[PDB]
Every structure is written in C-alpha cells, then in structure tokens.
Design a protein around this ligand. Structure first.
Ligand SMILES: O=C(O)[C@@H]1CCC[C@H]1c1ccc2ncccc2c1
Length: 166
C-alpha cells in the first residue's frame, strides 16, 4: 500500500494517471480490484490486462471458482488470490449498460469496495460496459467510504476527470 503520485479528490478517493498493472507490481497492495463479468472470463479491457500480468493464473483460478460456486450476480463480487499483483483480487461486476443492465447496479458494484480498508482500482463499467466514466467516478465518490486509489490509464480521460471533480 505504498502509493505515490496520487491526487486527493475527496477524504477517501485518490486518482493517478497510471496503468493499474504497473501500479500493482510496484505497490503490491493488499487488494487490487478487477472490473469483471459474471463468469469471470477475463477476455479484454482491465480484466484481460490483469490476467495477462499473472500469465493466466488468474483465469485458471477463476474457472475453478465458477465451477464450484456458479457465476456472480451483476453488482456482486468475490475475493480470490492476487497472485503476483496483490495479496487479494476483489473481482467486481458493474452493469453492462450497453446490454440493458440497470445503471443503478453501479452503486451496488462500488458498495463491495467498503469491505476493504484500502484498494487499488479501476473505474467500473467504463470501457466496453459503456457507462460514462465521469458518472462512474461520481458514483464511486458518493458510495465508497474506505480508501480507494484509482488508476486511470488514458491521459485524456484522467484530465477530464480531474477538471470535472476539482
Ligand atoms: O483507465 C482507463 O483508461 C480505463 C477506464 C476503465 C477501464 C480502464 C482501462 C482499460 C484498459 C486497460 N488496459 C490495460 C491496462 C489498464 C487498462 C485500464
């Protein structure tokens, strides 16, 4: 949890323009959040990047979790190993609004972060799930009460977020 170069937006939300994979390898936080789908198939986006950085160990472990427990619900989560990235990986499913899933479930997705005092995380439902990333940051700020360090890869998006929030 030795985070560096973050900008404090609220009492508990910090943001950096950084690749979440590089942040996790540098900091080795207690918890790294994955933006997952209900079957934990880490095919692209943040999920594909985190799985690739574990050389598919996250995917093998995720397939075993699904075989024994069944899929997650949208808005739900599970805690699995963080492998070489963190002590734990909190896989969280935000709604895929491009497929009609309710945007109200973005609040339930971010409520899962409150179970952990400190987390390294990406924005949920941004990217291929189609939610507006500034709206996703607003829900994070209104919902998360524990300390969250958000890593945002895209510099153009990072600048837009910092201007809208402060
Ligand atoms: O922070 C971003 O720019 C977006 C917003 C939500 C998903 C983030 C993202 C997407 C792909 C990625 N691919 C490799 C590493 C990190 C990655 C992060």
């Amino acid at each position: 949890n030795s985070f560096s170069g973050y900008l404090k937006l609220t009492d508990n939300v910090y943001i950096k323009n950084a690749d979440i994979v590089e942040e996790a390898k540098k900091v080795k936080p207690t918890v790294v959040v994955n933006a997952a789908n209900v079957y934990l198939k880490h095919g692209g986006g943040v999920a594909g990047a985190l799985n690739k950085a574990t050389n598919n160990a996250m995917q093998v472990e995720s397939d075993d979790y699904i075989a024994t427990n069944g899929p997650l619900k949208v808005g739900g989560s599970c805690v699995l190993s963080g492998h070489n990235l963190a002590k734990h990986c909190l896989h969280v499913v935000g709604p895929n609004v491009n497929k009609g899933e309710d945007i109200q479930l973005l609040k339930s997705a971010y409520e899962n972060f409150n179970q952990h005092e400190v987390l390294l995380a990406p924005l949920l439902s941004a990217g291929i799930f189609g939610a507006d990333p500034i709206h996703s940051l607003r829900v994070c700020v209104d919902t998360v009460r524990t300390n969250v360090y958000l890593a945002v890869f895209d510099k153009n998006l990072y600048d837009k977020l910092v201007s809208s929030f402060l």
